[PDB]
RNA sequence: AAACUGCGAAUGGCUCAUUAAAUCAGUUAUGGUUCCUUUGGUCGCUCGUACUUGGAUAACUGUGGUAAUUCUAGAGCUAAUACAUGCCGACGGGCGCUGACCCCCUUCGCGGGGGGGAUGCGUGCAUUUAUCAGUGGUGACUCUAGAUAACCUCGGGCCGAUCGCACGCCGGCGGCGACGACCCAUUCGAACGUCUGCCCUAUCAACUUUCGAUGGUAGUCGCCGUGCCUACCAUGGUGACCACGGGUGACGGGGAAUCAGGGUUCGAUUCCGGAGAGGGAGCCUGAGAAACGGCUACCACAUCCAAGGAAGGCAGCAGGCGCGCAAAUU
RNA sequence: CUCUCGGCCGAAGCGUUUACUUUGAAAAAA
């Protein structure tokens, strides 16, 4: 999977990639060191994360980003934009007058990094408030349950 | 609001200070300094409201120019300093020395002490960190930093401070069976020994606390102060030893002092 | 003036949001600091707390460092051959930071020629005028050479970066922001990222 | 030497505006013809040019040297220089004393 | 006093990192 | 007295026009920022005229101009904690690099190994970049500290050319204070965010996106996180769980009236938060205004005028007009 | 609820997740 596709040079910024190599040392490549960060709250590392080679930025295992704050959950509605995705949230707000529910929902663009493969339409995520992402996303992805009924 | 505010309305003013509703519109606005504006008491309040050496606010201006309060062994003479928990406020001039600690029902009561105890406080440390050239550094509730403390001392301990030098002399761990006393919240000014802590990663640290009657309560990690190590404290408790009477028992105790007096 | 308050934008729904106060001064921005290739020209502002930003218009000296060598060294800035964001950048010849730039390089060929006692970036006639004959060849004692001789075993460069000696200019990276800090700072470029910006400016031509 | 002077409705001239009529500029702290009530305060105000014609009520000129002639009451009178030197450089250079 | 602190806290922190090695090899024993 | 310097004038007071997920409330975040002041730390850590430096300017003294203002000009002096400039000292060195040379060792020897070293460059904390290793800390740092190569803005960063009171000891050393200061912490905040919560209306059912709408990459700007803005990409984003649009005699709360229980209505109004200073807009100074008892314009009103010009902002306290059913003392 | 760690307990998960109910904390003054 080629990661170089933007009109700049795709890079982990803490990994150093051009330290010197003697020919005796030239196995093929170096096998590029891969940098990224444990999470805490209990949530474990992908394995896709430590041995991918995607660049994310925003990625909360590869990236720069720090989760604080709310732990959320919701059900992934749209995947349709880049690295990001659309989950609903759905609760019963309380009428005091009546001492009776009504179902509502919020959407919520979160985003999802490429360490999650097979995310489908359906799905439990987890998610984790940070800093400001763009104009509308707060939360990055940090788990991924299946459907109930998943081959 | 352009700019910082310099004004506190009487009705807006921290309810632990006992102001009333008539004597004006305004309260003394405490001035910046070591104490959080809502956890202190402002050196007016002390002087004229609640030893009554003052009556008006430029009677407490006349005492604090002739420099005769120390606040921790420093003369002050801004009325409105802010003087918190475990201050030593002397008055050499009349010879007597009060620390401001918390009673029962969460106000700082008039606490006079010993001349001896007059040397020293405890405070909470609330950071420890390295800087310059590796030189390891404390910060206090008090505001105060002091370099070179020793390895063991660790975040939520407390520390027993020189007043005349400002070193530590030696320090209490946090731990299960210390002495406490509750700075904050609806269990303020209650001491009890630490039962456990339970620690919620990501969010506020929950502490239980046995008073010595055998009442249990719970407050934040940030609300508990270690006061002793055991069941000893190192500072002399106000007149209430820091147990809470309901208000049943408060109701006898007040019926039997009044049928005793006479 | 220029803004750059989030409540003029519209709601994430596409409504429109109307505004609840006037503009206010913490909100302010400033015209951009088209830094350009000349000397030395560098103007402060006045910001928020009353600190100072430097707002560099013309720069013409940088501090460029070869990673794989960690040698650092004060170089001149020659041109700008590559923008990722903006071609106009390039046409304009413009310092941001992430900008590509040909950097001289001559005190890397020094530091090179007195840390290795190898020849860097010569051509064939091999002329070798006095003062760089001897910081080539020298005499020195059993324990010197024998230095230099452990050292000259690991001192072999990438054929890109021996080709950019030989034009006596190298590809570098601006990893600093000049209308910011106003200065021009960043990283030779070599190993891979080369590759991909030499191919990038090539078919870019 | 031509110093200054005020035109025919008192409105000062300045040094650097070179016209013969009447300008509005925006004066700030540091400039001839304002005083600024305020820090950082700059007005808009009315100066005339520094160029000289007949439109003038006043013109302020300033001897530079001196002929053979003595004008009656312009060159023949002194003043004693009130308020000598203060700092104790000035005084030394003043009667040239030494360290000592 | 600079000089006095910095000489007070080396040994101070020598006497802790006794303390600690000593602690480490009551634990490598068992 | 005056005047220069410093500080404050960004609080307070008034009003409720705007404002309908906006404000505001509770709850969280800044591991994404700024912070005058108070409080504590730091302030011979840097190897490079001082027993004290320079030029002004005000007050003041004198000549004035204009019908007119808290308008100001020319001339003659003179101050600093205003403006600048700039050392000594601690100072002997240490530490990186350099490495003329010298010594020991082994090896016949070569050669290898180990030392001492003259001469040169650099050096502290802040700043900018790159690299290396892994004191203290966190749930989690690309945190803190450390090491290395450099940088360090003429529109410059710190490394005291300041004042007062007591006076002393041994020929030099000194006790209390006050001002000032880079940086760190603290206090007072502020500013953006997270989660949930708002009245009526479908005779408003699809809206946003060509002039950013939603997301990605790189940057610009900003105190910082962010379509905040730009370039190039992708075609997204919201909606009958009521989007979008319209209305409100809508500033939001704490609260108020009534009430068996449930409810209905009110909240311009003294506490908290927001907004505005006739309407828009743009700025200076400052730690903090997009400030209006600051300034610059345009629009609407309006004052003095010698007709050339000058000066405005009571939704502050009184008070007047007008409006009205409707509200107090210059 | 149990298998592991530290001094029979303190720790660790996770029992699918909740809603609900009870408690505790934090919640301006008026
Ligand atoms: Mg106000
Ligand atoms: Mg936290
Ligand atoms: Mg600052
Ligand atoms: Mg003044
Ligand atoms: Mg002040
Ligand atoms: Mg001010
Ligand atoms: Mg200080
Ligand atoms: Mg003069
Ligand atoms: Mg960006
Ligand atoms: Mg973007
Ligand atoms: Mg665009
Ligand atoms: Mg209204
Ligand atoms: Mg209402
Ligand atoms: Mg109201
Ligand atoms: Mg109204
Ligand atoms: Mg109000
Ligand atoms: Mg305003
Ligand atoms: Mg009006
Ligand atoms: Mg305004
Ligand atoms: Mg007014
Ligand atoms: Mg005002
Ligand atoms: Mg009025
Ligand atoms: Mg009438
Ligand atoms: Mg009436
Ligand atoms: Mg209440």
Redesign the pocket.
């Known amino acids: 999977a080629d990661i170089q ?15 010197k190599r003697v020919l005796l040392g030239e196995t093929g490549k170096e096998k590029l060191p891969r ?9 474990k590392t992908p394995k896709e994360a430590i041995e991918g080679t995607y ?4 990625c ?1 295992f ?9 732990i ?2 919701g059900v992934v ?10 989950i ?12 009776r ?9 979160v ?1 999802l990094s490429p360490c999650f493969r097979d995310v489908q339409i359906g799905d439990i995520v987890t998610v ?12 990055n992805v940090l788990k991924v349950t299946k459907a109930a009924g998943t081959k | ?15 632990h200070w006992m ?1 009333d ?1 008539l004597t004006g ?1 305004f309260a003394p606005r ?11 008491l402002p050196l007016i309040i002390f002087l004229r409201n609640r030893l009554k050496y003052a009556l008006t606010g430029d009677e407490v201006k006349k005492i604090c120019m002739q420099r005769f309060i120390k606040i ?1 062994g ?3 003479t ?1 009325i409105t ?2 003087a918190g928990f475990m201050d030593v406020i002397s008055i050499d001039k009349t010879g007597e020395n009060f620390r401001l600690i918390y009673d029962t029902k969460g106000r700082f009561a008039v606490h006079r002490i010993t001349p001896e105890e007059a040397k020293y406080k405890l405070c909470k440390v ?12 404390l ?1 206090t ?7 070179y403390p020793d ?1 063991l001392i ?2 939520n301990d407390t520390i027993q401070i020189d007043l005349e030098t ?1 070193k530590i002399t030696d320090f209490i761990k946090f731990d ?1 069976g210390n002495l406490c006393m ?1 700075t ?5 000014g209650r001491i009890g020994v630490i039962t ?4 919620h ?6 502490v ?1 606390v046995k008073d010595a009657n055998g009442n249990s ?4 990690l940030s ?1 508990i102060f270690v006061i002793g190590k055991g069941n000893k404290p190192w500072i002399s408790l106000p007149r209430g030893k820091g147990i809470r009477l309901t208000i049943a028992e408060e109701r006898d105790k007040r019926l039997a002092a009044k049928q005793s007096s006479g | ?35 350009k290739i000349g000397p ?17 218009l013309r720069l013409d ?8 060598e ?5 170089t001149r800035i020659i041109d700008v051959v590559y ?7 390039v046409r304009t010849k ?6 590509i730039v040909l950097i001289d390089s001559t005190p890397y060929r020094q ?1 090179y020629e ?2 290795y006692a190898l020849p860097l970036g010569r051509k064939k006639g091999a002329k070798l005028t006095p003062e760089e004959e001897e910081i080539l060849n ?12 452990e050292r000259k075993k690991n001192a072999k460069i990438s054929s890109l970066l021996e080709e950019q000696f030989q034009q006596g200019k190298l590809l570098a ?15 030779v470029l070599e190993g891979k990222e080369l590759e991909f910006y030499l191919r990038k400016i090539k078919a870019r031509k | ?1 031509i ?13 650097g505006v070179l016209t013969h009529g ?1 300008v ?1 500029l ?4 540091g ?16 100066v005339r040019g520094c160029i000289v014609d007949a439109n003038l ?2 013109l ?3 001897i530079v040297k001196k002929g053979e002639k003595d004008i009656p009451g312009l060159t023949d009178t002194t ?1 004693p ?14 009667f040239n004393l030494s ?1 000592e | ?2 000089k006095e ?1 910095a000489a007070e806290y080396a040994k101070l922190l020598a006497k802790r ?1 006794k303390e ?1 090695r000593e602690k480490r090899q009551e ?1 490598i024993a ?1």
């Open positions: 596709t933007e009109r700049a040079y795709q890079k982990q910024p803490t990994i150093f990639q051009n330290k940098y990224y960060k444990n999470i805490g709250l209990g949530f660049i994310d930025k925003k909360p590869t990236g720069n980003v720090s989760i604080r704050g709310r959320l959950s509605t749209k995947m349709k934009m880049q690295r990001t995705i659309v609903r949230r759905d609760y019963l707000h309380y009428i005091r007058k009546y001492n529910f009504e179902k509502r929902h919020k959407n919520m663009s985003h984790g408030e940070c800093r400001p992402l763009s104009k509308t996303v707060r939360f | 609001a352009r700019g910082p505010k310099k004004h506190l309305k009487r009705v807006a003013a921290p309810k102001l509703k519109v405490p001035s910046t300094g070591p104490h959080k504006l809502r956890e202190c921790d420093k003369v002050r801004d300093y802010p609330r950071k420890i960190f390295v800087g310059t050239k590796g030189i390891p550094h910060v509730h008090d505001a105060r930093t002091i370099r390895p660790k975040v400002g299960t509750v904050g919240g609806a269990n303020l456990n802590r339970e620690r990663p990501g969010s506020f640290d929950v239980h309560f719970a407050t934040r609300n | 003036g220029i803004s750059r308050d989030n409540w003029h934008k519209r709601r994430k729904t596409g409504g429109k949001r109307k505004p609840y106060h006037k503009k206010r001064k913490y909100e302010l921005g400033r015209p951009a600091a088209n830094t030395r020209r560098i103007h402060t502002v006045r910001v928020r707390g009353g600190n100072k930003k430097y707002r560099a000296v940088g501090n460029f460092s070869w990673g794989s960690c040698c650092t060294r004060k923008n990722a964001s903006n071609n106009e950048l413009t310092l941001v930071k992430n900008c530091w007195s840390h020298k005499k020195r004692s059993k324990k010197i050479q024998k230095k230099y001789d990276c601006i990893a600093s922001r000049p209308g910011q800090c106003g200065r021009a700072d960043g990283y | 030497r110093s200054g002077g005020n035109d025919k409705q008192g409105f000062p001239m300045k040094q009447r509005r925006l004066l700030s702290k400039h001839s013809c304002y005083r600024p009530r305020r820090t950082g305060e700059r007005k808009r105000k009315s009520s006043v302020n000129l300033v003043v220089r009130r308020l000598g030197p203060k700092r104790a450089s000035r005084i030394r250079k003043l360290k | 006093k600079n602190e990192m600690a634990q068992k």
